[PDB]
Write a protein that binds this DNA or RNA. Structure first.
Length: 52
RNA sequence: UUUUUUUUUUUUUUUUUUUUUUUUUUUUUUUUUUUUUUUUUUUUUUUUUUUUUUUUUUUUUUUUUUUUUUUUUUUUUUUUUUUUUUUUUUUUUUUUUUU
């Protein structure tokens, strides 16, 4: 269901990686769970993410 | 290995003794750490007796409203990758015993 014209405002391009797929989608999906937390003491989910 | 009082020279056995002694008593007197005399509330000028009082007052109550120091919405293990579950294990051993 290709979206209508709401294309985001991009920025400049950094150094080309083409290899970070081993962590970057996992990092975003785990950051979703970290954002779902509500206690600062329960921010050990972030530490578990970094350990992972 | 050997041993088994952290016993022992032989003597001895009151951390007793010159002799004399025995109130860490005594000059003789004495014996309220009493006393000039006379006194005896560390009472008193006369008044006086709420460290009461201007009058008025008397929630150190009140603008009107109000009355979870509740609430975006959604929610409700300050659970979870999967797998697991002696903060057990080389093997051999098992008085931190022995000449």
């Amino acid at each position: 269901e290709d979206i209508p014209d709401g294309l985001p405002d991009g920025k400049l391009n950094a150094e080309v990686s083409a290899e970070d797929d081993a962590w970057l989608p996992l990092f975003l999906l785990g950051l979703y769970r970290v954002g779902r937390a509500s206690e600062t003491a329960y921010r050990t989910l972030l530490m578990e993410s970094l350990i992972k």
